[PDB]
Design a protein around this ligand. Structure first.
Ligand SMILES: CNc1nc(N[C@@H]2CCc3c(C#N)cccc32)cc(-c2cccc(N3CCCC3)c2)n1
Length: 337
């Protein structure tokens, strides 16, 4: 028992499968988005209550909390737009067109220092081996500054993450390639083939000596940031960590969700990792170079596949989100020792 479970509560206001759910930087609000384009913003401590609800007319593909203005949420659409939404005013402050032929805003990342953000913008899917771009913006003006060239070719980027001080951005794409960007020189510092198939999520280790990825080949991999494509470790996760996520009845009728949101998340110092399963969140201890990966805690509580997760740590206490295909989000409260 590395954690004690103080409680599990359910947020049930969504009526469709969850696409993303993310805790804001204060650690006190959730923004969640379902596949019907319903955005919800809610607190959970001490109880769940909804602060904002809106239906998007246009498809929404991505979501990212601002780092230096807690109340602001970036939203990426399926029609080439990025919206700045103010969660206290309950209104879109602006909506900026990506003057391009790439309508799918697959990923948004806000710089730690709050001065910039990046988005991926991809062509329509045909599978997702399609052109995409990586855009850098200025938050103050909400104008694009530049686009990063992608080698060997433009490609849809599924995931982005900054490091702690924001001078590095790691990315994973539909070609299975990880591209790491120096955000000072604005160039690719490093890239390598990471997965057979798409990369779904990427993150810096706490110590920033490695990055972690998860992709379509079922694998969780740790990579040495000081030596391109040198694996540190590699685990085959259970299938239901990476999907595709399937809900059936007897009928011939199924719902299929391909990974879109974050497939893993971490505790404050990155000693533990939360992942999806059919039945709820599954948490593993990192750091080992053991053969099998040490599965230590199962959060449970889901009657439909979990398809995205989050983990925030605030007031010396852990908040885990697990989100399932029935629209249900479980918030599990953890304390360490
Ligand atoms: C608070 N309002 C606001 N903030 C802006 N930038 C913030 C600063 C910090 C931050 C972070 C972080 N961390 C992330 C994303 C955005 C931002 C920019 C604008 C803006 C920019 C252009 C046009 C318009 N409008 C509106 C009235 C007619 C046109 C408004 N508004």
């Amino acid at each position: 028992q590395p954690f004690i479970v103080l409680g599990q509560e359910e947020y049930g206001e969504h009526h469709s499968s969850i696409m993303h759910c993310r805790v804001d930087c204060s650690g006190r609000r959730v923004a969640s988005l379902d596949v019907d384009g319903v955005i919800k913003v809610w607190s959970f401590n001490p109880i769940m209550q909804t602060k904002a609800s809106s239906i998007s007319k246009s498809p929404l593909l991505s979501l990212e909390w601002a780092t230096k203005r807690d109340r602001l949420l970036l939203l990426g659409s399926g029609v080439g737009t990025v919206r700045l939404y103010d969660t206290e005013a309950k209104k879109n402050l602006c909506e900026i067109n990506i003057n391009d032929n790439m309508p799918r805003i697959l990923s948004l990342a806000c710089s730690p220092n709050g001065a910039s953000f990046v988005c991926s913008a991809a062509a329509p899917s045909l599978m997702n081996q399609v052109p995409g771009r990586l855009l850098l913006w200025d938050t103050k003006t909400m104008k694009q500054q530049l686009q990063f060239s992608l080698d060997p070719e433009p490609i849809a980027i599924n995931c982005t993450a900054f490091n702690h001080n924001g001078n590095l951005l790691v990315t994973g794409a539909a070609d299975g390639v990880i591209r790491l960007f120096d955000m000072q020189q604005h160039e690719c510092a490093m890239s390598w083939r990471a997965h057979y198939g798409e990369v779904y999520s990427v993150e810096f280790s706490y110590d920033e000596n490695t990055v972690y990825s998860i992709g379509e080949d079922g694998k969780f991999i740790q990579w040495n940031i000081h030596k391109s494509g040198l694996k540190v470790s590699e685990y085959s996760l259970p299938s239901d960590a990476t999907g595709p996520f399937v809900l059936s009845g007897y009928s011939g009728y199924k719902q299929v969700q391909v990974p879109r949101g974050r497939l893993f998340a971490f505790d404050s110092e990155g000693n533990y990792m939360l992942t999806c399963s059919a039945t709820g969140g599954v948490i593993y201890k990192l750091g080992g170079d053991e053969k099998v990966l040490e599965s230590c805690l199962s959060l449970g509580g889901h009657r439909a596949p979990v398809v995205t997760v989050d983990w925030s740590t605030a007031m010396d206490c852990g908040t885990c989100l697990t989100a399932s295909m029935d629209g249900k989000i479980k918030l599990t409260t953890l304390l360490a020792h």
